[PDB]
Structure formats: C-alpha cells, structure tokens
C-alpha cells in the first residue's frame, strides 16, 4: 500500500532514503555538501561549474524534496533547474549527493548531542589536564569531515573516559597547530625537571609512562587526523613488486606481479585506473602486494623538530629528548598505521569507483536500444 | 546441566590443569621459537596463528616470575581451580564487579578479603 | 577455557618407517595427526607441549602396520556454559555482533543486547552507541561476554554468547 | 593423495574425487569450508 498508493513517487522515497525529504534551509547544507563531495580525487562536474554546479544541485535537490521528483524526473523535467543536460549521471549523482549530505548532518547532530550530554556530566561531576566540553561544539560543526570527525569524537571518548555512571610535554593543540603549520610554535615541556623526576611524582619507576600518555593524547587528537589525512591520500607512489612467492604465483597476472620492478606508481594510476587497484586487491588478498608510497623517508623527519625543545643542558636537554620519545611513541601507536589505513581505503575507494564506472559505460553501450527494423524506421 | 557458573564438570575435566592468558601465550610462543628452527618442518597452521594473536592481546603480564607470583598468592585461598583462571585473566576493578561477573563469589568470601585481592592482582598487571 | 591434561592416542606406522628414525618419525605422525583437531569429549585441542612416553609396539597378526598406543601432554580448549570470557569483536550487523573466542566463533543477537545500544547503519562503520553517545562499541575491541550455550559441528565448536549481565563492554 | 602448493589453495591438502579438462575437485575431512571440500586447477598439483 505505501509503495503503490504512497503520497510521494516511488523512486523519490527509496532516493531519500535516509533523508526523508528536504527543508528549506536543509536544502542549502544538502546542496553544499553535494558540491563538496561530487569531485574530490578524481574530476567530476567541474559541463557544470562550481558554483553553478551547486546551485543546480540546490535546485535539484529541492525539487526532489517538494514536488517528490525523481532522477530523471528533474533531470528532463528540470533542465533548467539542474544542469540542463550537463551529464546523464545527474538526477543520480544529485540524489546520492542529497543522502550524504542528510546522512552527514545527522550525525553532526548525533555527535554534537553526544558531546553535549558528555559535558554536562563532566561538568556535573567535578564541579562539586581536565575534561573540557568545548570540543563538542567542534564536532558538531565538523560535518564534512567524516572519518576525522569520527576520528575526533573516538578521541574525545577516550581521553574524557567514556564512563558513563547514569603536565608530561607539550599541549596537544599546540602540537597539532604546530604540526600542522610545519613550524613548531611550542616547544616540549622546557622545565629542569627530566624522565627521572617525572616518572616518581605514576608508581612504576619507569621513565616511558608519560610516553605513554603523550602517545595517547597524540593520537586521539582530531587536529592530528587532519594534519596526516591527505598528506599521503593525496600522492602515494605505490611501487608495485612481486615477493618471493607472488613472482611465480602472480605470473603477471596482478598489479603486484605484472611489473617485476616497476614501482613508484602514484595516486593517479591506481585511483583513476580502477584496474590497478582491483590487480592491488587481487594480489595482496591471496599471496602478497606491493602497495608502499615510500615518500615518508622526508615527512617523518620535518616533525621530529617540531614539539621538541632546543636546548639541551639537563633540563633542556632532558625535555627535547622526552618530547622526542613521546613523538616516536604516538607515531608508533597511530601515526605510520592510521596513514596506512587511510591510504588503503582510498585505493579501495577508487578501485570501486573505477569497477561501477565501467559498468556503468558497458551499460549504457550495450542498452541503446538499436533495433533492425524496416528500411531502419 | 553442564554449567560453570555452579561448580559442576565432567569427571576428567575435574582433574584438568588450568592456564592462565598469559601461560598459554608463552607457551604458544616457545613452540613458535622451536618449530620455526629445525628447517625441513610443516610451518604452523592458521588454527596456531589465529590462536597466538588471539593470546597476545590478553597479556596481562609478560614475565613468567609474574605469572608465578600470582599463582602462588592465589592457591593459598581455599577457591576452586576454576576460579584461578577466570579471576586471574578478567582482572576485575572492585570486588563488586567481580561478584557480580562470577556467580560463585556471592557469599563465598568478605568483601574486603576480595577486594584486596583484586588490588593485588591490579597491581601486580604491567 | 585453556587446560593441561594428560591424553593418549594410537597410530599405526607402516613398516617401511621402521629405521634409525622410527621413534622421531612416530612423533612426527603424531604431531600431525593430533593437532587443531576436535572432539566432543575433551573439545577443542589446540598443540601438544610434550609426550609422556612411547609404548610398546604391538605387531599386528598378519598385517605389517604396528600400533603405538603413545600418551602426550598436551593442551585442551573445552568451554562450558556460565564461563565469562574477554573477546573481541570482529563483525558488527543488525542482526548480530559477531566475535572470535579464539579457535570459536560466537554470535548475539540484538534481543541480548539492551535497548540502549542501537544500530548506526547511516555512518560508514556498523557500530552502536547510546543516545548520549558516550560509550561506543565497535570491531576489533575487547569486548567481554558470557558462553550461555555451546554447539560442536563435527569438530567445530560454535558457542553462543549474550550481553545482558551488567559490566560487560569496555574495561 | 596430492599437494597443492600452488593455486588459489597455497599450500592445501586432501584427497582427488574427480577430474576434468583443467580442473580437479580434491576433497578431505580436516577442512570446515564448503563442508570439507575444495576445487583447484589439475597443473598445480604434485604427486605428493
């Protein structure tokens, strides 16, 4: 009955899905995050422009959202709303843009309350290194980034605690700025004391357990997410080389074994070529791949100076090599394996794009409805 | 009718030996270190890998003097061999959550005599 | 749980291992046959630490093969039901949380789980949260359960667990 | 009984139950996937 006798189409309500339907001023955000998100890596909708490109996503998206129009609905019904066939993957890209965007904002409100309510308890409980509910605010704005939102919020919870009952170095946010800026602002904690005085003042008689905790707050630190993300995604000169085994397993027949030595293939091969980042796949599922950007050797190197003091003269001395240890530890922990993982979801990511684009092509090939008709009417 | 929870097991699981998270992965371990020597030897299955990453992120504690320690503190009480394992690999905070976690504890001792022990054994953690 | 104890097997060795080597080769087949195995008496055997002594081997009337009734001592996984272990989550799906119990693989279903923990399918990551969003739970985390029901399919343990008894989550 | 060092099953073992053109379909009882059975070409097998 809802499918068939529904007040809206059909194709609109499985389109608006998570979003269902638009708001007026919901329209503006859906419509930004649309334009941020259509083109990123590769170009897509740069035929549309930037900002013509998003005012038609707006009008497109508030289409669907009012008059329940569908894909091709506004796409033909609404040429001049939306690009006026500017690409046949337009009512298509405007919808998947319009559920990001609802799906984005629904978890900045979702984060944004959580970070709210985390407050309040904190505020309630030692108000009769601190937990600060100012970073709630944060998340919540922090609706194009995704992942580094989430990253953030993870981080957030763990440094606070989570509980929910019903001075060891340089700041963290002086860090990241510092990181982030490639210029150390702040240097580690310049103070006489060392490793030796920290580690009696917790009861362990080791000279690492502040490390520990520096690693920690380094890592859970969303201002650290957004300084590596991109750093690596967007240049990775992937050399791909066959083991010792995937040689002879491979045969040339993956990514990994097709090129004995031909390494240093960057983003662009594996990204706009989905077919390297499915050989990738192929090869490292079953006997091994080669997918090493081998560029850090110098990005790790330019933050070893920064958040680490300058002197060293016992307590100076003894701060630049605390700093330097903590540094190591939180890259350990979440700095070297955090990149790895954003790296390798963006070459799954592309090698997926490139698989539906192909499909989509072969598709629209051999759809064409072209008929042998009489005399070819 | 087989249920920990109430003391009651098979008569040879009775007189079984039991082992500790950390036991158990040095054990794994040494056998890793042996078999991976003496070339010309069947490598070890996925059944061995899975089951060493599986220890590995339960370690408690890597020094097997640790391991002695505990267990000597513990066999002292008059607990079943059943509750050495349990209590000694959750590692519980307050006696109240290792009550509550372990059905057998309920009455079987004073709160502060558990309490004390789980200290100790939070301590003695690495 | 992991456990000692003291079992015993019989292999047949074929004649043409008879040699310098036999008692070498006799715990090389003995390695290989009693490893990863499972059987519903003594569960799930993960490696054997040691070998007890090498029996006498009685010559088939007959027939070349000779029967070693050999007794190592070797470990034993054999969960029982009350048991509260610390796994980890691998898999998170709205209809089930999906953990590894090392060498066992459990499953619990959304009923077991309160209400307050709920689906998150709009964010990439299948994970849930409260309402406040405090606590998060999500895969590779260790997370504790209860073995509220056991299950051998030829060999292949598959326990149930359930997330209803307070302070299970994280530590 | 025939070992497979090479193929999709690096390093398998079990036994032979039929043959075909480029393909042969070993079977063994160890195994829990596909209830203890599984498939791979005939070159990458050796008369173990």
């Known amino acids: 009955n809802e499918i068939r006798a529904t007040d809206l189409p059909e194709r609109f309500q499985l389109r608006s899905i998570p979003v269902k339907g638009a708001e007026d001023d919901e329209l503006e955000e859906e419509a930004d995050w649309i334009y941020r998100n259509a083109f990123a890596t590769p170009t897509i909708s740069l035929s549309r422009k930037g900002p013509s490109t998003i005012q038609k996503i707006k009008e497109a998206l508030g289409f669907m959202r009012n008059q329940h129009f569908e894909v091709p609905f506004i796409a033909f019904y609404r040429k001049e709303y939306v690009e006026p066939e500017l690409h046949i993957n337009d009512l298509w890209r405007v919808w998947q843009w319009d559920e990001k965007w609802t799906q984005l904002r629904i978890r900045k409100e979702n984060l944004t309350r959580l970070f709210e309510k985390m407050q309040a308890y904190q505020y309630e409980q030692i108000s009769a290194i601190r937990a600060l509910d100012t970073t709630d605010m944060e998340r919540l704005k922090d609706v194009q980034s995704m992942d580094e939102l989430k990253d953030v919020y993870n981080h957030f919870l763990l440094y606070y605690g989570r509980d929910i009952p019903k001075k060891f170095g340089l700041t963290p946010e002086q860090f990241g700025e510092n990181l982030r800026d490639s210029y150390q602002r702040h240097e580690t904690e310049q103070f006489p004391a060392e490793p030796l005085e920290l580690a009696k003042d917790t009861p362990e008689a080791v000279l690492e357990g502040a490390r520990y905790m520096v690693a920690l707050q380094i890592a859970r630190e969303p201002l650290v997410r957004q300084v590596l993300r991109q750093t690596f995604q967007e240049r990775a000169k992937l050399n791909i080389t066959p083991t010792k085994k995937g040689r002879k397993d491979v045969d040339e027949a993956h990514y990994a074994y097709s090129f004995k030595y031909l390494k240093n293939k960057p983003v662009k091969e594996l990204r706009d070529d989905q077919f390297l980042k499915i050989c990738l796949a192929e090869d490292e599922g079953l006997l091994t791949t080669d997918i090493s950007i081998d560029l850090k050797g110098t990005y790790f190197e330019e933050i070893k100076q920064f958040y680490y003091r300058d002197e060293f003269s016992h307590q100076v001395q003894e701060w630049n090599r605390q700093r330097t240890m903590a540094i190591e530890r939180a890259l350990q922990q979440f700095l070297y394996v955090q990149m790895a993982k954003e790296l390798k979801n963006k070459l799954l990511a592309e090698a997926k794009e490139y698989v539906i684009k192909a499909c989509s092509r072969k598709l629209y090939n051999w759809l064409r409805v072209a008929p042998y008709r009489p005399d070819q009417q | 009718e087989e249920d920990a929870s109430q003391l009651i097991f098979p008569k040879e699981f009775e007189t079984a030996e039991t082992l500790l998270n950390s036991e158990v992965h040095m054990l794994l371990e040494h056998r890793k270190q042996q078999n991976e020597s003496a070339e010309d030897e069947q490598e070890l299955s996925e059944v061995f890998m899975k089951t060493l990453n599986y220890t590995a992120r339960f370690s408690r504690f890597k020094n097997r003097e640790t391991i002695a320690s505990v267990r000597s503190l513990l066999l002292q009480k008059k607990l079943h061999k059943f509750e050495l394992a349990c209590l000694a690999n959750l590692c519980p905070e307050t006696a109240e959550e290792s009550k509550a976690l372990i059905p057998s504890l309920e009455g079987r001792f004073e709160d502060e005599e558990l309490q004390q022990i789980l200290d100790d054994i939070q301590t003695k953690r690495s | ?171 | 009984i025939v070992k497979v060092i090479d193929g999709p099953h690096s390093g398998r073992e079990g036994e032979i139950r039929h043959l075909f053109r480029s393909f042969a379909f070993l079977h063994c009882k160890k195994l829990v996937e596909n209830g203890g059975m599984f498939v791979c070409k005939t070159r990458h097998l050796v008369l173990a």
């Open chain 3, 1 to 171: 749980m992991f456990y000692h104890i003291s079992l015993e097997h019989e292999i047949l060795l074929h004649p043409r291992y008879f040699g310098p080597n036999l008692l070498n080769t006799v715990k090389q087949k003995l390695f290989t046959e009693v490893e990863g195995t499972c059987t519903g008496k003594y569960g799930f055997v993960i490696a054997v630490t040691t070998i007890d002594n090498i029996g006498a081997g009685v010559i088939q009337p007959g027939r070349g093969f000779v029967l070693y009734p050999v007794k190592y001592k070797a470990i034993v996984f054999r969960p029982f039901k009350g048991e509260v272990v610390d796994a980890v989550v691998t898999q998170v799906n709205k209809v089930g949380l999906f953990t590894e119990i090392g060498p066992m693989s459990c499953f619990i279903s959304r009923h077991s789980i309160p209400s307050e923990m709920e689906f998150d399918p709009n964010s990439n990551p299948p994970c849930y949260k409260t309402m406040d969003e405090d606590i998060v739970i999500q895969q590779d985390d260790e997370i504790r359960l209860k073995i509220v029901g056991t299950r051998v399919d030829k060999n292949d343990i598959f326990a149930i667990g359930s997330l209803m008894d307070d302070y299970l989550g994280l530590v």
